[PDB]
Amino acid sequence: PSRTALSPGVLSPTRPVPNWIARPEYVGKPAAQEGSEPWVQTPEVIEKMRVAGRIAAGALAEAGKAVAPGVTTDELDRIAHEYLVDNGAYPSTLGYKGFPKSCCTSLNEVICHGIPDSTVITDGDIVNIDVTAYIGGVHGDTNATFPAGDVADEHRLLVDRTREATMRAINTVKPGRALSVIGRVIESYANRFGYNVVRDFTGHGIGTTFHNGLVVLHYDQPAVETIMQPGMTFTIEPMINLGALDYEIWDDGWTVVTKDRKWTAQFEHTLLVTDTGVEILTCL
Ligand SMILES: CO[C@@H](C(=O)NCCOc1c(C)cc(C)cc1C)[C@H](O)[C@@H](O)[C@H](O)/C=C/C(C)(C)C
Ligand SMILES: [Mn+2]
Ligand SMILES: [Mn+2]
């Protein structure tokens, strides 16, 4: 048997960031200035995005190494926060539209945007950690779902097949291809197992802004005409559900849960379209 439905916990105090680490402009503001930026980045921006991406990947991997029964989601946030700040990076989530922590922790039925808190991870859980770094005036965004203890076969396979859907989508990225191939590959692969691909939350372009206005759909919609071109940077971040797509948001305004409480898994990388294919910017 696995645990029952989750409920929210208490948050730790706000974690500070040294003043010499520049903040994204949206920290301390009610909204973010994003969504109208170019989709192809300059070579100087891309080089800085490699640095941001590798730092985010390191924070993700260090917090992921700590996932085990008995650990709180707050303790994962502390690890990610300190990794970023020791690397001179600001955690992009912290202060984005008032989000109170440095990463998102989404267990089990939480589709995305779970808030690190007193919640204790237990055996059988699947834990998504989502970390973004802001450094050099650019962002790097990545997430992964990590098993805690011995996970039930249905949940283990959900995580492994979500990871594989993500990698197959990444491996389609090439200049001249339609962006819509990403969602076609994810949803074709998920539908083999009878999983449902979340639609309402998407991948996105990323650069000097966190969400630049480019949308990357994870389901199949061949009417989108956008093509991949060298220098475009975006995330692929599919959420895949064992149950129905219907969802609720907690009173915290962030945490998104499946209405049937069936579990869901996600992986994310920030990608660069190169002249021949793709480069993952959020690798160690
Ligand atoms: C699944 O979650 C992704 C997500 O919301 N996509 C939808 C992005 O919608 C847009 C689009 C499509 C355009 C603009 C201009 C702005 C937004 C938020 C995130 O990008 C996630 O990867 C990120 O780590 C977390 C960010 C906050 C918790 C701080 C929000
Ligand atoms: Mn993310
Ligand atoms: Mn993202």
Residue 1 alpha carbon to ligand 1 centre in Å: 33
SS3 85: helix
Handedness of CA 23, 8, 79, 218 (dihedral sign): negative
Give dist(CA 143, CA 106) in Å, integer.
10
Give 247's contacts (C-beta < 8 A, 6+ positions apart). Answer: 111, 200, 256, 257, 258, 259
- How far lies 78's CA from each of 60, 63, 114, in Å? 12, 9, 15
Binding residues for a divalent metal cation: 130, 141, 204, 237, 268
The response to whether residue 213 sits with its C-beta less than 6 Å from ligand 1 reads: yes
Give 233's contacts (C-beta < 8 A, 6+ positions apart). Answer: 39, 41, 46, 49, 205, 206, 207, 270, 271, 272, 273, 281
Strand-strand pairing, 110-112 and 104-107: unpaired
The response to whether residue 139 sits with its C-beta less than 6 Å from ligand 1 reads: no
Vertex 240 angle, CA 234 and 34, to 5°? 30
Instruction: Name the closest-CA residue to atom 1, ligand 1.
Output: 201
Binding residues for substrate: 113, 211
Give dist(CA 31, CA 77) in Å, integer.
23
Instruction: Name the closest-CA residue to atom 13, ligand 1.
Output: 213
CATH topology for 39-282?
A: Creatine Amidinohydrolase (3.90.230)
Atom of ligand 1 minimally distant from the CA of 254: 28
Q: Which phi and psi (to 5°) does residue 171 adopt?
A: -70, -5
Ligand in nearest proximity to the CA of 213: 1
In the numeric block, which tokens belong to residue 92? 């992009």
Residue 56 alpha carbon to ligand 2 centre in Å: 10
Note whether 234 and 205 are within 8 A (CB): yes
Atom of ligand 1 minimally distant from the CA of 132: 24
SS3 186: helix
Atom of ligand 1 minimally distant from the CA of 97: 29
**Residue 7: count of CB within 10 angstroms of its CB:** 7
The response to whether residue 184 sits with its C-beta less than 6 Å from ligand 1 reads: no
- The structure's method of determination equals X-ray
Give dist(CA 191, CA 236) in Å, integer.
18
User: What are the boundaries of each domain within the chain?
Assistant: 39-282
- How far lies 254's CA from each of 8, 112, 176, in Å? 11, 8, 36
| Ligand 3 ion local residues (Cβ < 5 A) | 141, 235
The response to whether residue 268 sits with its C-beta less than 6 Å from ligand 1 reads: yes
Instruction: Name the closest-CA residue to atom 27, ligand 1.
Output: 93
Instruction: Name the closest-CA residue to atom 28, ligand 1.
Output: 113
Residue 202 alpha carbon to ligand 3 centre in Å: 8
Give 223's contacts (C-beta < 8 A, 6+ positions apart). Answer: 180
The response to whether residue 202 sits with its C-beta less than 6 Å from ligand 1 reads: yes
The response to whether residue 141 sits with its C-beta less than 6 Å from ligand 1 reads: yes
Q: Cα 175 to the chain's mean position, in Å? A: 24
Q: How many residues does the chain have?
A: 284
The response to whether residue 109 sits with its C-beta less than 6 Å from ligand 1 reads: no
Give dist(CA 234, CA 236) in Å, integer.
7
